[PDB]
Design a protein around this motif. Structure first.
Motif, PDB file in Angstrom:
ATOM      1  N   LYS A 147       0.848  -1.192   0.000  1.00 49.82           N
ATOM      2  CA  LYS A 147       0.000   0.000   0.000  1.00 49.82           C
ATOM      3  C   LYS A 147       0.885   1.244   0.000  1.00 49.82           C
ATOM      4  CE  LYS A 147      -4.721   0.715   1.586  1.00 49.82           C
ATOM      5  NZ  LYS A 147      -5.809  -0.080   2.213  1.00 49.82           N
ATOM      6  N   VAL A 148       1.343   1.606  -1.197  1.00 50.01           N
ATOM      7  CA  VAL A 148       2.109   2.823  -1.424  1.00 50.01           C
ATOM      8  C   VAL A 148       1.484   3.565  -2.596  1.00 50.01           C
ATOM      9  CG1 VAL A 148       4.270   1.979  -0.444  1.00 50.01           C
ATOM     10  CG2 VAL A 148       3.787   1.579  -2.867  1.00 50.01           C
ATOM     11  N   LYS A 149       1.614   4.894  -2.576  1.00 51.31           N
ATOM     12  CA  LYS A 149       0.998   5.708  -3.618  1.00 51.31           C
ATOM     13  C   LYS A 149       1.587   5.394  -4.986  1.00 51.31           C
ATOM     14  CE  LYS A 149      -0.665   9.847  -2.950  1.00 51.31           C
ATOM     15  NZ  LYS A 149      -0.627  11.207  -2.349  1.00 51.31           N
ATOM     16  N   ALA A 180      12.576  11.400 -12.856  1.00 50.69           N
ATOM     17  CA  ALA A 180      13.278  10.175 -12.499  1.00 50.69           C
ATOM     18  C   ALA A 180      12.246   9.071 -12.318  1.00 50.69           C
ATOM     19  CB  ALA A 180      14.116  10.353 -11.232  1.00 50.69           C
ATOM     20  N   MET A 181      12.746   7.855 -12.125  1.00 54.15           N
ATOM     21  CA  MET A 181      11.939   6.702 -11.761  1.00 54.15           C
ATOM     22  C   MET A 181      12.306   6.253 -10.354  1.00 54.15           C
ATOM     23  SD  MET A 181      11.203   4.045 -14.847  1.00 54.15           S
ATOM     24  CE  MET A 181      10.867   4.569 -16.524  1.00 54.15           C
ATOM     25  N   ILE A 182      11.354   5.605  -9.687  1.00 55.55           N
ATOM     26  CA  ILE A 182      11.569   5.190  -8.308  1.00 55.55           C
ATOM     27  C   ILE A 182      12.579   4.053  -8.277  1.00 55.55           C
ATOM     28  CG2 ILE A 182      10.510   4.089  -6.319  1.00 55.55           C
ATOM     29  CD1 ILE A 182       7.948   5.719  -7.059  1.00 55.55           C
ATOM     30  N   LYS A 183      13.607   4.209  -7.446  1.00 58.96           N
ATOM     31  CA  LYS A 183      14.661   3.213  -7.320  1.00 58.96           C
ATOM     32  C   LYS A 183      14.385   2.219  -6.204  1.00 58.96           C
ATOM     33  CE  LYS A 183      19.713   3.084  -7.646  1.00 58.96           C
ATOM     34  NZ  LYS A 183      20.952   3.896  -7.535  1.00 58.96           N
ATOM     35  N   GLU A 184      13.767   2.665  -5.113  1.00 59.38           N
ATOM     36  CA  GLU A 184      13.489   1.804  -3.976  1.00 59.38           C
ATOM     37  C   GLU A 184      12.272   2.339  -3.235  1.00 59.38           C
ATOM     38  OE1 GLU A 184      14.998  -0.978  -3.581  1.00 59.38           O
ATOM     39  OE2 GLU A 184      13.968  -1.619  -1.752  1.00 59.38           O
ATOM     40  N   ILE A 185      11.519   1.423  -2.631  1.00 60.52           N
ATOM     41  CA  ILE A 185      10.348   1.748  -1.826  1.00 60.52           C
ATOM     42  C   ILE A 185      10.611   1.263  -0.410  1.00 60.52           C
ATOM     43  CG2 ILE A 185       7.909   1.283  -1.417  1.00 60.52           C
ATOM     44  CD1 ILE A 185       7.650   1.032  -4.532  1.00 60.52           C
ATOM     45  N   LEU A 186      10.485   2.171   0.557  1.00 60.18           N
ATOM     46  CA  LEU A 186      10.889   1.913   1.930  1.00 60.18           C
ATOM     47  C   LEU A 186       9.823   2.446   2.874  1.00 60.18           C
ATOM     48  CD1 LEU A 186      14.535   3.157   1.427  1.00 60.18           C
ATOM     49  CD2 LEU A 186      13.919   0.749   1.743  1.00 60.18           C
ATOM     50  N   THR A 187       9.934   2.051   4.139  1.00 60.12           N
ATOM     51  CA  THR A 187       9.018   2.521   5.167  1.00 60.12           C
ATOM     52  C   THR A 187       9.714   2.426   6.515  1.00 60.12           C
ATOM     53  OG1 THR A 187       6.743   2.374   5.996  1.00 60.12           O
ATOM     54  CG2 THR A 187       7.953   0.302   5.713  1.00 60.12           C
ATOM     55  N   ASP A 188       9.232   3.226   7.462  1.00 63.56           N
ATOM     56  CA  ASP A 188       9.687   3.148   8.839  1.00 63.56           C
ATOM     57  C   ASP A 188       8.774   2.213   9.629  1.00 63.56           C
ATOM     58  OD1 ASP A 188       7.427   4.715   8.881  1.00 63.56           O
ATOM     59  OD2 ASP A 188       8.198   6.113  10.389  1.00 63.56           O
ATOM     60  N   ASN A 189       9.039   2.101  10.932  1.00 64.08           N
ATOM     61  CA  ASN A 189       8.226   1.239  11.778  1.00 64.08           C
ATOM     62  C   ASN A 189       6.842   1.820  12.027  1.00 64.08           C
ATOM     63  OD1 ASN A 189      10.826   0.161  11.909  1.00 64.08           O
ATOM     64  ND2 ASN A 189      10.546  -0.564  14.015  1.00 64.08           N
ATOM     65  N   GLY A 227       4.968   3.238   9.732  1.00 65.06           N
ATOM     66  CA  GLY A 227       4.205   3.219   8.505  1.00 65.06           C
ATOM     67  C   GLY A 227       4.482   4.364   7.553  1.00 65.06           C
ATOM     68  N   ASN A 228       5.269   5.357   7.962  1.00 62.24           N
ATOM     69  CA  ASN A 228       5.632   6.438   7.055  1.00 62.24           C
ATOM     70  C   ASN A 228       6.517   5.898   5.939  1.00 62.24           C
ATOM     71  OD1 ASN A 228       4.499   8.571   8.942  1.00 62.24           O
ATOM     72  ND2 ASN A 228       6.160   7.760  10.218  1.00 62.24           N
ATOM     73  N   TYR A 229       6.173   6.239   4.701  1.00 59.24           N
ATOM     74  CA  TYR A 229       6.821   5.681   3.522  1.00 59.24           C
ATOM     75  C   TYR A 229       7.827   6.676   2.957  1.00 59.24           C
ATOM     76  CZ  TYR A 229       3.253   2.034   3.556  1.00 59.24           C
ATOM     77  OH  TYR A 229       2.442   0.978   3.909  1.00 59.24           O
ATOM     78  N   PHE A 230       9.047   6.202   2.718  1.00 55.71           N
ATOM     79  CA  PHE A 230      10.102   6.981   2.090  1.00 55.71           C
ATOM     80  C   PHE A 230      10.466   6.357   0.750  1.00 55.71           C
ATOM     81  CE2 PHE A 230      11.402   9.944   5.421  1.00 55.71           C
ATOM     82  CZ  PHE A 230      10.803   9.383   6.529  1.00 55.71           C
ATOM     83  N   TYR A 231      10.846   7.207  -0.200  1.00 53.70           N
ATOM     84  CA  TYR A 231      11.125   6.791  -1.566  1.00 53.70           C
ATOM     85  C   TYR A 231      12.484   7.318  -2.001  1.00 53.70           C
ATOM     86  CZ  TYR A 231       6.061   6.214  -1.338  1.00 53.70           C
ATOM     87  OH  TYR A 231       4.785   5.867  -0.955  1.00 53.70           O
ATOM     88  N   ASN A 283       6.019  13.634  -7.262  1.00 53.40           N
ATOM     89  CA  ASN A 283       4.874  13.920  -8.114  1.00 53.40           C
ATOM     90  C   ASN A 283       4.770  12.837  -9.174  1.00 53.40           C
ATOM     91  OD1 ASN A 283       4.080  16.992  -7.349  1.00 53.40           O
ATOM     92  ND2 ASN A 283       6.310  16.737  -7.329  1.00 53.40           N
ATOM     93  N   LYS A 284       3.569  12.290  -9.338  1.00 53.34           N
ATOM     94  CA  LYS A 284       3.335  11.215 -10.296  1.00 53.34           C
ATOM     95  C   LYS A 284       3.167  11.820 -11.683  1.00 53.34           C
ATOM     96  CE  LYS A 284       0.986   6.747 -10.364  1.00 53.34           C
ATOM     97  NZ  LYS A 284      -0.120   5.940  -9.789  1.00 53.34           N
TER      98      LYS A 284
END
Ligand code: ZN
Ligand code: ZN
Ligand code: ZN
Lengths: 50, 148, 97, 144, 148, 50
Positions: free
Chosen positions: D89-91, D110-119, D121-125, D140-141
């Motif tokens: 469940k990521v945007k 650019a294109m997304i290189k990695e999809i990450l999250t913290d404990n 639930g906050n998502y970092f890209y 921005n998509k």
């Protein structure tokens, strides 16, 4: 070929007394004859004494 | 006064080794039942894709093979025998290949069936055949094949 | 010749669905394989085929209008079509209202 | 990190797993997902299924023959069917065109290189050419 | 040792500026999807009407364009991209036009996508490409396009 | 070629004996010969003593 009312038909340059590319070959001869004769005039005839 | 034994083109059965060779880029030759014998290749460079050629001969300076993109099927590989193009050749289309059971007449006028374990050739290009249990090498005319 | 004069078409073979009722002998109204029709279909096979005489014959009746017509096709060699096989031509679009 | 994806790189490993008989999941472009399988018994040939859900007492997969092309396998992404995750469940999905701003306030794509999250639930890209992480809002998509 | 940057033929989106240019009499070039590329013009003199020509080249002393009356449609202008004939030309049919997102390989063996901001040419007619975030100008072969 | 009630027939200038452009070439020769013979009169024949 005539298949189920379909029809395909071809007649080529090939013939019992003329080859497929012989139209172009003849034209290339007509071209070489003009070219070759005109270039021998640049070098000229050979001569040797005797 | 002869030439050393000639190896037969081993068919490849395991799909895994076939795919590994293909990934390495080594050419493959596929004996299709319906529409003859074709070559199969992996495209060089980054744009990976399978290619086919019907330029069915060893590559030569005067004869360069042309490769067309094709969607080769796994089932085609599995059901059809495949050979390495480095091996499969016109050099020896032996009538009785290795491991083939053939019928041979023994000196006691009793026909026996034996499996060809080794085959070689001589100056005249003849096909000397070695049969298990015997040392003398037979000739083409003496032998016979039994099918089914 | 056939590959030349033909049109690209998807050939999918036909076979009776297992969902047929064993007693009445008539099919289930809805199932994944066949949508009410009593005949299912296999995966499609890309094929070139020639087609002729295509007709959109309209019959106006008390039940309503109905589209039905004859189209004559000619296949390639070695292909053995069967009764109630199905073809679809993505290239050609048909207007309806 | 997230354990929702484990794509296979080599086709050789794919063939090895097919020999073992384990099912595979093969994605498509603007099209339904596919499952692929090797038939059992004497005759070996590929089989496919348009269904995706797990087998159960109320749901059974349907298998049919098909001349699967190696091009699809080598090109498209492949997973083990049992270990595949339906959705993260990521945007933004992975390998998606995105727009951002560089450190010098310059806009760049650019294109997304990695999809990450913290404990929490906050998502970092992380984007290509950018080691630092970006917020979901900061991205921005890009429209196709 | 190069040639200065070459401007791309800006498509015109606003209908108002299109009509204003037409009223001024400046030639327009319309890329019809179905039946190719055509020129559009307003008739000189008092009898105002739109004219079309398929004499699809720059006007020259030896090549004078012929204009036929036609009832050009507003919808045609709106749905079809239109260019000023003073700009649109064979001079540079660049494979990767300006503002196009293209995929380029960076020195760290990581493929990145960037938008072409500037394009120029050199003595050999090559197409040097400028990408945002980098100063070195790439070449045609190095780059790649991603569609859809 | 005949398909589904529509038929077309074309006969090109190509032939086994002469190529499709042979008429244009042969007319070009007819002009060049006149053009070249007339121009040679502007320069004239070449002479050298011996
Ligand atoms: Zn001399
Ligand atoms: Zn059914
Ligand atoms: Zn003189």
């Amino acid at each position: 070929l005539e298949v189920d009312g379909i029809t395909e038909t071809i007649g080529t340059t090939q013939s019992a007394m003329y080859g497929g590319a012989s139209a172009q070959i003849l034209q290339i001869n007509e071209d070489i004859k003009e070219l070759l004769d005109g270039l021998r005039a640049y070098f000229g005839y050979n001569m040797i004494g005797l | 006064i002869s030439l050393n034994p000639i190896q037969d083109a081993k068919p490849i059965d395991d799909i895994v080794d076939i795919m590994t060779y293909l990934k390495n880029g080594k050419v493959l030759r596929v004996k299709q039942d319906n529409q003859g014998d074709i070559l199969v290749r992996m495209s060089p460079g980054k744009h990976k894709f399978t290619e086919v050629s019907r330029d069915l001969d060893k590559e030569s300076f005067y004869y360069k093979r042309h490769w067309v993109l094709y969607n080769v099927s796994v089932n085609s590989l599995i059901t059809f025998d495949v050979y390495l193009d480095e091996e499969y050749s016109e050099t020896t289309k032996v009538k009785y290949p290795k491991d083939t059971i053939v019928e041979y007449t023994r000196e006691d006028q009793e026909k026996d069936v034996a499996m060809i374990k080794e085959i070689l050739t001589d100056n005249n290009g003849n096909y000397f055949y070695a049969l298990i249990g015997e040392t003398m090498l037979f000739d083409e005319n003496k032998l016979n094949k039994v099918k089914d | 010749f056939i590959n030349d004069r033909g049109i690209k078409v998807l050939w999918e073979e036909a076979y009776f669905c297992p969902c047929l009722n064993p007693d009445t002998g008539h099919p289930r109204v809805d199932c994944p394989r066949c949508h009410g029709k009593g005949i299912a279909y296999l995966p499609p096979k890309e094929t070139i085929m020639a087609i002729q005489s295509q007709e959109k014959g309209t019959n106006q009746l008390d039940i309503g209008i109905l589209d039905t017509g004859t189209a004559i096709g000619t296949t390639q060699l070695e292909k053995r079509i069967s009764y109630r096989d199905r073809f679809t031509v993505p290239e050609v679009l048909m207007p309806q209202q």
